[PDB]
Structure formats: structure tokens, C-alpha cells
RNA sequence: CAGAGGUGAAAUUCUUGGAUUUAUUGAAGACUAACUACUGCGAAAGCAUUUGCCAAGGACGUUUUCAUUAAUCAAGAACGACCAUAAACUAUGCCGACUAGGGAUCGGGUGGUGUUUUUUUAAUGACCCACUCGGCACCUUACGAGAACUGGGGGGAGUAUGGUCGCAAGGCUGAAACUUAAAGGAA
């Protein structure tokens, strides 16, 4: 638990998989998956001591496209999941309004722009 | 007009085995593993050691006088892996490429129905 | 050429919208090897048959695997990376390992990971495409992959954790990319073994010899006061 | 140490060839060595005990038996020709395996029953619940009871079609799968069950042997043969 | 007939007194594959081959019977000298005395009126549809004070230290009372 390049690898397997023996360690990691991966970690490390309001902060996006990305994705998230559910395949477990974070949501970097959870509904 | 013995392929993970019987499986005609072809001890699984293997094999069933084989194509099966290893389809391969006919390719790995596992 | 060839598979009825739209790129796909292949929509089934033209004669064994990898939901552009020579499927067998249903779904969620990231790691270092499916794993990869992926999903199903395997493995990428110390043994390397194992119980088995017979037959119920009364 | 020097051992090898019974197509099924008929261990009781297993479309020219494997025992050597008696039935593997779909119930059954010979024979069965055509429900479970029942009638009918048969009968009874349609005529009063097959038969025990039986089987056949012209 | 395991490679091991592979057969101890499910049953731990016996249980059906026999739980009871063993390890959710639903599924029942079934041997199916009762879940909705195997210091992230308790430097070794050998180190 305190192995800090092994959970980095953890965590950092999807989005290096997205942007590929493959290559995890730094001083070797070539352009955007060392950007998000550097973008991921200084997120993680200053997510602590930050403020909430202002350490994820979203990019500005209207609203008549900003609600149509959220709704394509969730479009995405229940297909995949759907289908895996009818299959046999055991997906990852989430919480309750956050989004189920899937191949497009590391491809398309869909979170800067639509967030983890709609954080409307999760203050109300 | 062919003369028939089988085949008898077993290609586990560590070594693959091309041992052409009769058409009973009593008599055997020229048993070559993949291991005694060329060793490197690891090198005994692999695509050439299989094609190695197969060939001597059509060598000595072209001498007998079999024409062509039936493929029982088998793994270690049992409590364990069930897939036929690298040197499966190349013993195969080499054993078709080598003048034998082929007919009646068939997997008969041992599924061990209810096995002894815990 | 050879004699015929024909095997089949039956796929379960959700899947027929997604065979249907990717059947043509199977027809190519196969044609190549030549291998005709039929998509029945009202069996619910998937047969491919060696043709007059097949040269190849273990390329229907490939395409059992492909047509089998289809129906157990893997999808079109993992599923025809079983048609090359390097690479092969296993479908490891899980169900049979622990007795109660919260340690078995805890143990293979615990295979999954948290957010996914066990199984994806598992993906990129094995080089293997894995589907944990009910109670059974997929995977298609390299032979040397499958071993890696079988002995982890296994000592997964038992009591240890699946991220040790993933540190040795890590470990052993980082130590087999050097010339030397590769005829050495690496045990010192990993620290998989870990020598837990160091409880050993050691009390008087006053009651633990012979206490507390089965009887068959209940005792009687104390009574309530109104019984007594009555 | 010291190991051994070769001297071939396909210079003392006899062929003979597999004369299959007349309840099959054409008879001919192939050749199998022996070792040279010296005195101790002459080559006819070096064979008699040899099945060999072959394919039920080899030995009916059609490839609707591609499946369904059968055993040829060897009785009776004359004149380099093995005579065979039928020895048992099997499927292959990927058969049964292509029949196994989930969403259904596989009844399965098996009797041991003495025909009218004194073989006895272990003689399975398995049948699958189909679903009906408008059935818009995706499931086709039997209740259990339902299977009980047809498991019940599969075991009494099968057993009425052993005992009611010899051997040769049962066999050209299970060539053209006509048993299978006689279990779906008397379970479709209870399930609909899709393609139910007998998909193994074992010899247990044989009587006798009885070489007029055998070769009453066959055909007939006797030699005078050449005598030496000194 | 000369190797077989096994490994990332190896090795311990077996093997020309024939291992591994193949075929026939026997014996043993387990286990019940695929079918196998966000299905079933059980008070829970748990329970998967067939057939039979033994008692049990639940839901439904009921114009059957008794007539308050009831609900909750501290206490107590039931279940849970030889051969040596693993459990947890990323998780989740707002609760109850609470309204309606929706789709799917399991068991029973009623009605409909088509297809599979079928006939003067017994009874008995399967599917479709509506309704209804009871379950395992899932997706939502509306509305409420929801108060009155034991041992515990006090937030998170840090920073400084003339205090207290420790651990730690030197400097070629031999080699000090001896400016001392051999040998080694270093450059």
C-alpha cells in the first residue's frame, strides 16, 4: 500500500493503455500520456491540502453542448454497461452519481469538460 | 488408396509431443517429441521444435507406408490449462506440409468433468 | 487439401444485433484463410467449415476459437487477433475454489480492482486481453502471457492478492531487461514469498479433547409463570 | 550408462486390415499393424483385444455422422482380415459442447440394460428444453418435475427399445438416429426439448463369443488353400 | 524409444530394472464440469449427478376448523498417542411508523382462446395474454423528527528546536608500552 511506483501504475494503467512491452516509468514516457499522467498526479497530490471549489476546476463549456456531451456519454456509459450486465462480465464498482469512467472517458479526456458527478444533484 | 494412422499431437505449455499410431492406437510409428529435436530446455514448446518433430515423424510414415492421418489434437486438459500450447497447429502444419494427408482434426483434451480441485 | 472440417458454436440471443452488423468483416476476415463461415439468426448459432481451398490445415481450429471468443462477448477487433499464429485464448475456471458466495464475489471483484486498474494492469503487463465473466476468466494473448495470467487468477481465488502478482511482475520486466542475471534465480528479487505462515496454536484442550456430545432429542422449555401458576 | 543399439522394428510387422460388421456402409475401415506371427505370442491372440475407434461418417459415407464416434472390437482373425463386433458409441467433445447453451435445461439420463444377447450395456441420453415458436419469455426452464417425468420416459422408452433388440439391431437402430425421434414423439406431451441424442453406449459385460454369431454377422468363409509343389 | 517434469531461466525428482506418450483394464479417495442466472431453497452457517425411502417446510386454493390462543426481546436453550491447516486487504448507502408505481423473473391460482399437443388405457402438459396472491432483486417516485470480542486521545497537512533521552564522527590497517615485519588497501 505504501509501494508509490506500483499504485502509481495502478492508476495511472488506464490512460497509458489509452496512449501506448509497453513503457510506465518515467524517463520514458513520450508526450500525452506523460502529460495527463503528470496532469493526474499533481491532481491526486494537491487534492488534499486545495480547496474543493478550486482544485477541479471545469473547463468552460456552454450549456446546450455541455449538457449534450453528458448526455452522449451517459449513453455510452449505459450501453457498456448494459451490455456487460448481460453478458457475464463483472464491471468495476462506482458510486452512486458519479460516472462510470470507461475507454471513452480516458480517450476523449470527457472529465475536464463534464466532471465526475453532476454537482448539482450531489448537493442537493 | 491412403493408409491411415492418427496422429495423436499432445502440445502442452514446456514441450509438444507428435506421436502417430495406428488407426487402434496399439501400435505406435516413430514417437518425436518437441524436446529431442532441439533443446535449449525452454525451446521444447516452440513453433520449430513442433515443425522439427512433425517432419521426422512423416519421415518415418512415409517409410512405413501411412499416407495420411487423423488429428487428435490434445493439451495437458485435466485440472488445468485446456488449451493446446504454440506447437499444436505447427506440428500440424508441418505434418500436412511433410506429404501426409490430413483428415478428422479433432480436440480430445481430457475435461475433467467434476475435477479434485479443493 | 483436406477431407472437412466443421465446427460450431451457438451464441446467446442479445448478441445477434452486434454479429450481425460485424458478420461481413468475419466473412473477409476468414475468407483470406479460406474458411466459409454461416451466421444462422433462428438456430442462434455460428458454424465455420473448412472449404475446398484450405491449405492451412490448423486455421479451423483458429476459427473455433474466434467464433467461440464471439459468442463469450469479446468484441470483433480483439476477437481477430486469434487468427495469428502468436496468439491463443484460455478460459480459466474460478467457481470451484471457495464455498461462500460474499468471499467468492469479494475475491473476484478483488480480481477486477478498484475503478478496473488490477484488471488493466494485468492487461498491459500480460500483454492479454482479460474478461472476468461470471464465474469464469477469459483471455487471449501470448502463451508466456496465459501462464502469467492463469497462475495470477488462481492465487487470486486463493487468499492472496492479486497486486503481489502484479509487483513481481513489474519486477520481473525491470529484472529480465538486463543481459546478466539471467540465468540467476530471482527468488531474492521477489518479494512474493513472504513467510506468513508463523501462527502455530498451543493451549491445554480441556474441552477441545472430548467435550459436548450430540444429543438427537431438545431439552423442555423453562415455562412462564402462568404455567407454573396453572 | 550403456543403452541399447536399433535394429528396425518394421521388419517383423504384419498388416492386417479392419473388416467392419454389416449392420454399416462400406466395410473397410483400414489396416493396423502387429508384430510377425512366431510361436510364443503368435499374431491372432496378439490381437482380439484391439478396438479401434472410428468415425460413423467413414462408415456411412455421409457427413451428417461427423460427429458420433463409434468402437470396433476385434474377435475373430482369418485369412489377414480382423473381423469386428460393434464395442460402443461416443460423441466428440465439441458436439456436445456446441449443443450446451445457457437459458435451457440439459435432461440428461442413462440405463444399464441387457439386450437379447447377454451384453449389457450402459446406454446414456441427453435432450435440452427448447422453447416454443411465440414464446416471447427468454428462459424455456423445465420444472424440475417436468424433467423427473422426462427423464422418466426417456429411461422406460430406451429401455423398451434395448430388450426388443440384439446387438446388431440395436446398432442399426442407433444408425439412423431413429431412437432420438421415438424420445421426441413420447416427450412432446411434456417439454418441446431440442435435440435430444443417445450420445454414449459402453459395453459393461459380453457373453460369450460365439464365432456362428460372428460370422453370421459378417458373411460366411472357409479355405483350402495351396499346398507345396514338391 | 531417450528423454519427461518444471521454470523467466534452472534445479530437487523420474528414467534403457523403459520415464513421458499411446491402447485395454482394474483399484482408490474425492468431486458433481458446461447447464449455472443480480435464479431457487434453507433460521443462519449454507445447499447442485440419478433413483427410492423417511419425516419436514413455504407460497397458493379454500362458502374447512378453533376462537384471541397474539408482538418484541435482557436471562436461558438449539444450530453454527496419530496426518496438519488462513482469514481480511478499497468498500457505500440516508434512515422509518412511509405513498404510489415500472419492467423482468420464481411458485400458486382464475379467466380467455390460438398454436404446439392429441385418439376409448390412467391422469398430466408447453407457450401467448389479462388479472391476482406471495417471494429474490432492480429502477424510480411522495412524506415523516428520525431528538428527549473490553482497554481510547482529540482534527488534517506541515515547520522550527541553545530542553531531555538516545544513535552516530575521527582516521591507512597490522601497530602499541615498540615510529615495528610480512601482507593487504588506496592512489
Redesign the pocket.
Known amino acids: ?1 505504501n509501494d508509490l511506483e506500483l499504485q502509481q501504475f495502478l492508476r495511472e494503467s488506464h490512460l497509458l493503455s489509452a496512449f501506448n512491452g509497453i513503457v510506465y516509468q518515467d524517463d520514458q514516457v513520450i508526450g500525452k500520456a506523460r502529460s495527463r499522467t503528470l496532469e493526474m498526479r499533481l491532481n491526486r497530490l494537491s487534492r ?2 486545495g480547496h474543493q471549489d478550486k482544485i477541479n476546476k471545469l473547463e468552460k463549456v456552454p450549456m446546450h453542448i455541455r449538457r449534450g456531451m453528458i448526455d452522449k456519454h451517459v449513453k455510452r456509459i449505459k450501453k457498456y454497461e448494459q451490455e456487460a ?1 448481460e453478458g ?1 462480465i463483472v464491471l ?2 462506482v ?2 452519481g458519479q460516472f462510470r469512467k470507461i475507454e471513452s472517458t480516458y480517450k476523449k479526456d470527457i472529465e475536464r469538460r463534464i466532471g465526475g458527478s453532476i454537482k448539482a444533484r450531489d448537493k442537493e | 488408396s491412403q493408409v491411415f494412422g492418427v496422429a ?1 499431437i ?1 502440445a ?4 509438444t ?1 507428435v ?1 502417430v ?1 495406428d488407426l ?3 501400435e ?1 510409428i516413430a ?6 529435436k532441439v ?4 525451446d ?1 514448446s516452440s513453433p520449430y521444435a513442433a515443425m522439427l518433430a512433425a517432419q521426422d515423424v512423416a519421415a518415418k510414415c512415409k517409410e512405413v507406408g501411412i499416407t495420411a492421418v487423423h488429428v487428435k489434437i ?1 493439451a ?1 486438459g485435466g485440472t488445468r490449462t485446456k488449451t493446446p500450447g504454440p506447437g499444436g497447429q505447427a506440428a500440424l502444419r508441418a505434418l500436412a506440409r511433410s506429404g501426409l494427408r490430413i483428415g478428422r482434426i479433432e480436440d480430445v483434451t481430457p ?1 475433467p ?4 480441485r479443493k | 487439401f483436406a477431407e472437412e472440417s466443421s465446427f460450431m458454436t451457438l451464441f446467446p440471443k442479445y448478441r445477434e444485433s452486434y454479429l450481425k452488423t460485424i458478420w461481413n468483416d468475419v466473412t473477409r476476415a476468414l475468407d483470406k484463410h479460406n474458411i466459409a463461415c454461416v451466421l444462422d439468426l433462428v438456430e442462434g448459432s455460428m458454424t465455420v467449415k473448412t472449404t475446398r481451398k484450405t491449405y492451412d490445415p490448423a486455421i479451423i481450429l483458429k476459427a473455433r476459437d474466434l467464433i467461440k471468443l464471439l459468442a463469450r462477448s469479446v468484441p470483433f477487433p480483439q476477437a481477430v487477433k486469434i487468427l495469428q499464429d502468436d496468439m491463443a485464448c484460455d478460459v480459466i ?1 474460478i ?2 475454489f471457495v ?3 460474499e ?1 467468492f464475489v ?1 475475491r473476484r ?2 480480481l477486477v480492482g ?2 478496473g486498474n488490477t484488471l488493466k494492469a494485468l492487461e498491459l503487463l500480460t500483454k492479454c486481453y482479460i474478461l472476468v465473466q ?2 469464469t476468466v477469459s483471455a487471449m494473448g501470448p502463451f ?1 502471457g496465459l ?1 502469467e495470467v492463469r497462475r495470477v487468477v488462481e492465487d487470486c481465488m ?4 492479486p497486486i503481489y502478482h502484479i509487483k513481481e511482475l513489474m519486477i ?1 520486466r525491470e529484472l ?1 531487461k538486463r543481459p546478466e ?7 531474492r528479487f521477489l518479494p512474493m514469498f513472504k513467510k ?2 508463523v ?1 502455530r496454536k498451543k493451549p491445554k484442550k480441556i474441552r477441545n479433547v472430548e467435550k459436548k456430545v ?1 444429543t438427537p432429542f ?2 423442555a ?2 415455562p412462564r409463570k402462568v404455567d407454573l401458576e396453572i | ?1 550403456q ?2 543399439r ?1 535394429v528396425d ?1 518394421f521388419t517383423r510387422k504384419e498388416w492386417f486390415d479392419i473388416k467392419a460388421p454389416s449392420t454399416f456402409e462400406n466395410r473397410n475401415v483400414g489396416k493396423t499393424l502387429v508384430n510377425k506371427s512366431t510361436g510364443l505370442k503368435s499374431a491372432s491372440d496378439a490381437l482380439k ?3 479401434v ?1 472410428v468415425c460413423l461418417a467413414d462408415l456411412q459415407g455421409s457427413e451428417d455422422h461427423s460427429f458420433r464416434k463409434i ?1 470396433l472390437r476385434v474377435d475373430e482373425v482369418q485369412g489377414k482380415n480382423l473381423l469386428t463386433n460393434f464395442h460402443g458409441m461416443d460423441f466428440t467433445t465439441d458436439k ?2 456446441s449443443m ?7 435432461i ?1 439420463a442413462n440405463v444399464t440394460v441387457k439386450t437379447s444377447d447377454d451384453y449389457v450395456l450402459r446406454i446414456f441420453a441427453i435432450a435440452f428444453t427448447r422453447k ?1 415458436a ?8 423445465a ?1 424440475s418435475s ?1 424433467i ?1 417425468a422426462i ?2 420416459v426417456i429411461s422406460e422408452i430406451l429401455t423398451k427399445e434395448v430388450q426388443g433388440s440384439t446387438l446388431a439391431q440395436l446398432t442399426s437402430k442407433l444408425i439412423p438416429e431413429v431412437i432420438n425421434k421415438e424420445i421426441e ?1 413420447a416427450t ?5 426439448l431440442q435435440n435430444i441424442h443417445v450420445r454414449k453406449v459402453k459395453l459393461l459385460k459380453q457373453p460369450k463369443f460365439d464365432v456362428g454369431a460372428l460370422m453370421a454377422l459378417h458373411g460366411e468363409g472357409s479355405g483350402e488353400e495351396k499346398g507345396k509343389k514338391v
Open positions: 500500500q488534499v491540502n450486465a457475464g468495476s464498482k458510486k452512486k | 495423436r499432445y502442452s505449455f514446456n514441450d509431443f506421436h499410431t487402434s492406437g496399439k505406435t514417437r518425436v517429441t518437441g524436446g529431442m533443446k535449449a530446455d525452454r521444447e490434445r495437458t475435461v468433468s467434476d475435477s479434485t | 475456471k467457481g470451484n464455498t461462500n458466495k468471499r469479494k471483484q478483488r478498484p475503478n461470471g464465474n508466456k501462464k486463493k487468499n492472496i492478492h520481473k529480465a542475471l539471467a540465468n540467476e534465480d530471482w527468488s506468513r505462515n501462527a450430540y431438545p431439552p422449555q423453562l | 550408462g543403452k541399447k536399433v522394428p483385444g484391439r478396438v475407434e468402437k456436445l459442447r450446451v447453451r445457457k437459458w435451457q435445461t440439459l440428461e416454443q411465440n414464446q416471447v419469455k427468454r428462459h424455456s426452464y420444472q417436468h423427473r427423464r422418466k414423439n412432446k406431451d411434456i417439454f418441446p
